[PDB]
Design a protein around this ligand. Sequence first.
Ligand SMILES: COc1ccc(S(=O)(=O)N(CCO)c2ccccc2CN(C)C/C=C/c2ccc(Cl)cc2)cc1
Ligand SMILES: [Ca+2]
Ligand SMILES: [Ca+2]
Ligand SMILES: [Ca+2]
Ligand SMILES: [Ca+2]
Length: 144
Amino acid sequence: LTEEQIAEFKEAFSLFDKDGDGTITTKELGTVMRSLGQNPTEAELQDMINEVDADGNGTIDFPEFLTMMARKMTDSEEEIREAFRVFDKDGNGYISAAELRHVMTNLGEKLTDEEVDEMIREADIDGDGQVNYEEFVQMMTAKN
Ligand SMILES: COc1ccc(S(=O)(=O)N(CCO)c2ccccc2CN(C)C/C=C/c2ccc(Cl)cc2)cc1
Ligand SMILES: [Ca+2]
Ligand SMILES: [Ca+2]
Ligand SMILES: [Ca+2]
Ligand SMILES: [Ca+2]
């Protein structure tokens, strides 16, 4: 993995690790999931951790987070369409910088307006300034 790839994998880890202690717990995962419109049970949350908890300490650290990421990037298209609907709040089929800003805000992240534009620009393929589903699939999965 390149160094750019790595510092971004470290930013994703920070969204889930709210308290910043280097571990992702079931309570931190349930907080993120609910901020994304989901509602996992206590058992579903433990299962998410158990699938990648190699050392058996009940939490997810950075190596196990990178293993979880490599798995999700399965062929469960519904998981991707569900995530798209969370960004696409007005449902018109295109994620705007404003809608994307709103999502990061509900995850409590402090971001600049340009930083949101950089995020759109990297997922944008046709150049229309927004992210449709096909571009979303390629951003979320190993497609292309
Ligand atoms: C239901 O399954 C999920 C769960 C969480 C997310 S996630 O998006 O929270 N996520 C970031 C934390 O790892 C993520 C998770 C897994 C894989 C990829 C990502 C996206 N990252 C790389 C940055 C993405 C940047 C980006 C840009 C442009 C647009 Cl329009 C939208 C997003 C997605 C689907
Ligand atoms: Ca933590
Ligand atoms: Ca662990
Ligand atoms: Ca939209
Ligand atoms: Ca686009």
